[PDB]
């Protein structure tokens, strides 16, 4: 019956998308991974060397170790009553730089830019107003919402 | 429901119709008749000046409305009972064995029906007059006379039901005492 190997139950998981097959591109090779970076572990099915286990597909963690052809990632791993910090050894082709902190980094750089403009006599952008407030609505087009006999005839097939 | 449904009947010159709590009495010549209709729950009225009998059903569905044309037929039947009477002529039909019917006073005895040795006896109520016609005029005829249609029949029916062929083909063996003419006395 069902067996438990390294690649068991990975028929659709370790498969390339339709018309998106092929070995990884040049921009993957030129991407710089550093220790301390957040990375997504997504197995490339065309490489089949340094591949992560099926659990770590879709998991993201920080890089703890960089090696000539490989990357070390620390991944959380809920085991019974606690989560373990697991260090997986994969090739560089199975990791992507993570945009998980992109919105937070953009928020930090907005604050410094706002601070600089505020300290030195500059025009800050106007504050956004809530859309949930009230007001007077002047409707250009007003229609009658009602059920018609045509609605019931339409829904009958054949 | 229908708010008001009614039936109208015309009363002839010599007959009087009285209603009192759904109890109808019809008195013409040759007798008087009574009907207890307290099971019907209708509004019966008599207009003496215009000589008309009306029955009304207020706020009725189909079932109570069917009972006002039944009432109109019943009261009509008493009108033609105490004006003209009811006469039922009943004939005995046989293939081989003559059916000997003997009518005494209010008593009917039937013998030799299909050769049987059992005598069938029927006692006619005093409100129905039973007679045997002259065999010279017409052969094997018995006549029931009375004012009540429901009573003149049910004597002709009881006579018919007692001469029923048993354990034989009924399509063959057509012997019996069947009612032929339903007419009036006058």
């Amino acid at each position: 019956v069902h067996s438990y190997g390294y690649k068991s139950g990975t028929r659709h998981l370790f498969a390339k998308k339709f018309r998106k097959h092929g070995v990884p591109s040049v921009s993957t090779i030129l991407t710089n991974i550093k220790v301390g970076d957040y990375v997504d572990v997504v197995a490339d099915s065309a490489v089949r060397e340094g591949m992560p286990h099926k659990y770590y597909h879709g998991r993201t963690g920080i890089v703890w170790n960089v090696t000539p052809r490989g990357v070390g990632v620390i991944i959380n791993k809920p085991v019974r009553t606690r989560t373990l910090r697991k260090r997986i050894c994969v090739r560089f082709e199975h990791v992507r730089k993570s945009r998980c902190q992109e919105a937070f980094k953009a928020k930090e750089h907005q604050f410094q830019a706002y601070l600089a403009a505020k300290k030195a006599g500059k025009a800050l952008p106007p504050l956004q107003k809530s859309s949930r407030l009230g007001g007077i609505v002047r409707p250009k087009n007003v229609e009658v919402l009602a059920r018609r006999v045509a609605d019931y005839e339409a829904m009958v097939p054949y | 429901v229908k708010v008001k449904s009614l039936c109208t009947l015309q009363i002839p010159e010599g007959v009087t119709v009285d209603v009192k709590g759904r109890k109808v009495t019809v008195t013409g010549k040759r007798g008087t008749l009574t009907k207890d209709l307290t099971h019907l729950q209708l509004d019966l009225r008599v207009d003496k000046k215009n000589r008309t009998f009306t029955v009304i059903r207020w706020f009725g569905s189909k079932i109570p409305i069917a009972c006002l044309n039944t009432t109109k037929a019943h009261v009509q039947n008493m009108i033609t009972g105490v004006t003209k009477g009811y006469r039922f002529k009943v004939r005995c039909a046989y293939a081989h064995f003559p059916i000997n019917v003997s009518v005494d006073g209010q008593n009917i005895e039937v013998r030799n029906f299909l050769g049987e040795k059992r005598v069938r006896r029927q006692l006619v109520p005093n409100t129905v007059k039973v007679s045997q016609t002259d065999p010279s005029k017409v052969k094997d005829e018995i006549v029931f006379d009375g004012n009540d249609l429901e009573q003149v029949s049910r004597e002709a029916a009881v006579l018919h039901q007692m001469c029923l062929v048993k354990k034989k083909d009924i399509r063959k063996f057509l012997d019996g005492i069947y009612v032929q003419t339903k007419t009036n006395i006058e």
Partner: protein, 178 residues
């Protein structure tokens, strides 16, 4: 008794956005026990007709429409109901009532008793007061008679609650136990 349904006019639209800076405003007619059910029925029509969700729209008004003065009238109610066996069944029925809400409340009790239809399976299409000469049903047209009268028969007249008794003398009004 006063009707259990109220005449509501719910007015609403989809919230203005970049795709729809000036959305269409829709006026909806519903007969509901309260305005919370009225708004629920308004957003059910908006979703299944105009593809607008209650979470992406706003309500401009949910007021009650005032009844006309009480006059004995004939009301044409265009109504529909859903059953699993037959699907959608749309009927036009005539009612004798004094108000639009009373006629529609009567039509809801009528569809419940005769067709076992509940409120949320029923859709009212139109209610209007029609003249006597446009009435098709004989059961409604029998009340147009210029001189219409009838006796009150088979009536169970209960006593005033204060004056009701348990045991009463047979042919008197005296109360033995009360």
């Amino acid at each position: 008794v006063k009707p259990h349904l109220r005449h509501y006019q719910v007015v609403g639209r989809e919230s203005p956005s970049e795709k729809n800076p000036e959305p269409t405003v829709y006026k909806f007619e519903v007969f509901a026990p309260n305005f919370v059910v009225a708004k629920s029925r308004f957003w059910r029509m908006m979703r299944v007709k105009n593809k607008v969700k209650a979470t992406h729209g706003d309500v401009l008004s949910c007021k009650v429409v005032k009844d006309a003065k009480l006059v004995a009238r004939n009301y044409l109610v265009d109504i529909a109901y859903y059953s699993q066996r037959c699907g959608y069944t749309r009927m036009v029925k005539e009612f004798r009532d004094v108000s639009k809400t009373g006629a529609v409340s009567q039509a809801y009790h009528d569809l419940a008793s005769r067709h076992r239809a509940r409120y949320h399976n029923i859709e009212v299409l139109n209610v209007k007061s029609i003249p006597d000469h446009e009435v098709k049903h004989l059961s409604i047209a029998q009340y147009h008679a210029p001189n219409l009268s009838f006796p009150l028969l088979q009536r169970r007249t209960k006593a005033t609650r204060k004056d009701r008794a348990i045991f009463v003398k047979k042919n008197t009004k005296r109360a033995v136990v009360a």
